[PDB]
Every structure is written in structure tokens, then in C-alpha cells.
Write a protein that binds this ligand. Structure first.
Ligand SMILES: *[C@@H]1O[C@H](CO)[C@@H](O[C@@H]2O[C@H](CO)[C@@H](O[C@@H]3O[C@H](CO)[C@@H](O)[C@H](O)[C@@H]3O)[C@H](O)[C@H]2NC(C)=O)[C@H](O)[C@H]1NC(C)=O
Ligand SMILES: *[C@@H]1O[C@H](CO)[C@@H](O[C@@H]2O[C@H](CO)[C@@H](O)[C@H](O)[C@H]2NC(C)=O)[C@H](O)[C@H]1NC(C)=O
Ligand SMILES: *[C@@H]1O[C@H](CO)[C@@H](O)[C@H](O)[C@H]1NC(C)=O
Ligand SMILES: *[C@@H]1O[C@H](CO)[C@@H](O)[C@H](O)[C@H]1NC(C)=O
Length: 285
């Protein structure tokens, strides 16, 4: 009882992070506000990729202007890093597991060439007007305030072509693709370069909707299933014992519990279970 992929749910505003969520490394340490370009400016648009399952890459977009002279980096990643966006914390004063899963956009001056050219990619893909850029900027702000949480897993029926997709992730690469589609809306024209992205895939049958955080944990909810989800999540955080628990839940018993849109789903795992691909997603036309 649904359409093929569950759509990503947006919000009217971005809440402040709970004080329980603290980062070891600060999010967007050099982030400057997005400047306003001159309309007739020429802004080179660069593809940026670097390593974070041998090929797990981080994506970002570069901008260089001819009038400003300076260049800039733009990315979208986790406020408290990947693990906190993928698995929750269990606190004893709460029936429900707590997440620090917020991701957001980061924009700052300068492009660190060595960071991307060493073990990654740095290639110009477009040239847009300042006007376009400014318009793009506006969209980013809206996006930054409506798409507030980071999601790791792409959930698909099988590695085959044409296989049904249950869930799309919402990470850095998806942000880059959103920006490029938006630029395409303005009429921007991309070079024809092979652009491959990292995608972390879970393979399962049709998911089942288990419920929101109050429909599962708390007084008006199932107890056995809540303790089941808790027992599923506990090994993913503080070793060998946890590895065996994870292998038994995911491989032997073919079970996954997916947090998506702040709701809980069940994934009947299958096939190669967890694959990390580096596949082509073409630039928009
Ligand atoms: C998208 O939304 C996020 C979250 O609301 C914004 O993140 C915030 O970005 C600013 C600067 O970009 C951060 O402030 C910085 O703090 C460091 C030290 O903490 C300082 O060295 C910098 O000079 C700057 O003051 C801020 O911490 C960060 N996080 C939060 C929770 O506010 C982001 O700026 C937004 N991006 C866009 C393009 O709208
Ligand atoms: C993931 O989130 C946890 C929970 O907020 C962070 O762990 C806290 O980190 C602060 C600062 O280092 C410590 O003072 C707290 O004691 C930690 N709490 C717990 C429960 O571990 C953690 O830093 C986050 N992960 C990353 C990579 O930033
Ligand atoms: C960005 O500008 C710096 C100089 O400030 C330069 O070292 C770097 O190569 C530039 N990168 C790109 C992609 O233009
Ligand atoms: C990019 O992905 C395609 C799949 O569409 C694959 O055939 C190709 O080998 C990949 N290229 C690289 C450099 O990994």
C-alpha cells in the first residue's frame, strides 16, 4: 500500500540540535555566507570527489569566478558524522532511541586542490552566469531549511537493472545532484564527462511500515517489537560479539530495521544484502 519509492519528507524549519548531540570535529568550521555575484559574471562549476567497499567517496561542488578571482567549495554532510546519522543512541531515560542525524549545507572560500586531486577527482563540468549562481544560492537556502536530516541507506529490491527501489538516500551526492538539476532548470549546460557516485545499497523485499516513534515506544505501543529494535541497534555502538549479533540479524535471519522519515520500517534482507557501488549518474540534460 504505497508508491514505488517512499518520498523524502521535508520540514517547514530546521530545529536547533539537541544539546545531547555534540561533535568531536566541528561542522563547517570555515563556513562563510554565500556572496551575491554580478549578473554577467562567468562562474566555472567544478566536480569535487575524494575518499571518505574500496570506493566510498565524498562529493562536493566547486565554484570559481572570473570577476571575484576567488573560488569556493560547497558540500552537504552530517553535523555529527556518519555513524550518528546511521544508528541511534540508546538513553535509559527514554523509551525511544535518540538520533543525531541532521545534515546540512556548507559553503566556504577556497578550493583545496590537493585534497581532491590526490586520490579523487577535480574536473570542471560547467560555466554559469552570476545570475544563475545567485538564483541557485537562494534555492540552496530553502533546501538547507527544509531537508534537515541525513540518510545513509539506498534500499533496492535487487542489483538488477529495472529492479524496484524502496528508498533513496539523502546524503552529499544527492545534494550535488539536486544542485546540478536546479542549474539545469536555469538552462545551464554541462560537459559530457563520466560522473560516478558512491551508493551504499541494502537489498530486501518490500518493506513493511512499523510506525512512528510514539507508535512503537512508550505506553501506546508494542513492547516486544520495541525491545526487538533496541536489540537490533545495540551492537552497532559501544566488538566480536557485536559483529556476530549483526551478522545473525542481517545475514542469518535476514532482518533490518530502517529509520526513514522519522518512522520505523522492516527490511527483509536478500541477495548480496549490503553492496557498495560506484556507478554512473549522468549530468542532467
Ligand atoms: C545550512 O544550515 C546549517 C545548519 O543550520 C548551517 O550551519 C552553520 O553554519 C555556520 C557557518 O556556515 C556555522 O558557524 C561557524 O562556526 C564556526 C565555529 O563553530 C566558526 O569558525 C565560523 O566562522 C562560523 O561562525 C555554524 O556552526 C553551523 N551550524 C549551526 C548549527 O548553526 C549552514 O551555515 C547553512 N548553510 C547554508 C549555505 O545556508
Ligand atoms: C555522535 O554523537 C555522540 C552523542 O552526542 C557524540 O558523543 C559525545 O561527544 C562529546 C564530545 O566529544 C562527549 O563529551 C560526550 O560524552 C559524548 N557522548 C556520548 C554518549 O558518546 C559523538 O561525538 C558523535 N560522533 C562524532 C563523530 O562526532
Ligand atoms: C582556487 O584558488 C586557489 C588560490 O586562491 C588556487 O590555489 C586553486 O588552484 C584554485 N582552485 C581551482 C579549482 O580553481
Ligand atoms: C562508472 O559506473 C559505470 C556503471 O554505470 C561503470 O561501468 C564504470 O566502470 C564506472 N567507472 C569507474 C571509473 O568506476
Amino acid at each position: 500500500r504505497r508508491h514505488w519509492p517512499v518520498p523524502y519528507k521535508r520540514f517547514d524549519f530546521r530545529p536547533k540540535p539537541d544539546p545531547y548531540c555534540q561533535a568531536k570535529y566541528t561542522f563547517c568550521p570555515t563556513g562563510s555566507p554565500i556572496p551575491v555575484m554580478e549578473g554577467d559574471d562567468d562562474i566555472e562549476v567544478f566536480r569535487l570527489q575524494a575518499p571518505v567497499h574500496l570506493k566510498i567517496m565524498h562529493d562536493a561542488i566547486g565554484f570559481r569566478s572570473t570577476l571575484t578571482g576567488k573560488n569556493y567549495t560547497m558540500e552537504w554532510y552530517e553535523l555529527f558524522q556518519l555513524g550518528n546519522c546511521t544508528f541511534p543512541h540508546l538513553r535509559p531515560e527514554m523509551d525511544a532511541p535518540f538520533w543525531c542525524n541532521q545534515g546540512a549545507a556548507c559553503f566556504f572560500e577556497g578550493i583545496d586542490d590537493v585534497h581532491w586531486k590526490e586520490n579523487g577527482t577535480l574536473v570542471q563540468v560547467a560555466t554559469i552566469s552570476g545570475n544563475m549562481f545567485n538564483q541557485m544560492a537562494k534555492w540552496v537556502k530553502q533546501d538547507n531549511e527544509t531537508g534537515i536530516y541525513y540518510e545513509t541507506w539506498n534500499v533496492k529490491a535487487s542489483p538488477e537493472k529495472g529492479a524496484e527501489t524502496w528508498f533513496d538516500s539523502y546524503d552529499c551526492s544527492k545534494f550535488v545532484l539536486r544542485t546540478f538539476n536546479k542549474l539545469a532548470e536555469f538552462g545551464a549546460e554541462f560537459k559530457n564527462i563520466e560522473t560516478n557516485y558512491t551508493r551504499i545499497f541494502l537489498y530486501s523485499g518490500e518493506p513493511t511500515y512499523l510506525g512512528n516513534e510514539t507508535s512503537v515506544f512508550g505506553p501506546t505501543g508494542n513492547k516486544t517489537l520495541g525491545l526487538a529494535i533496541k536489540r537490533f541497534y545495540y551492537p552497532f555502538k559501544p566488538f566480536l560479539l557485536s559483529l556476530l549479533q549483526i551478522f545473525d540479524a542481517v545475514i542469518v535471519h535476514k532482518q533490518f530495521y530502517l529509520f526513514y522519515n522519522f518512522e520505523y520500517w522492516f527490511l527483509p534482507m536478500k541477495f548480496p544484502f549490503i553492496k557498495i557501488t560506484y556507478e554512473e549518474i549522468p549530468l542532467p540534460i
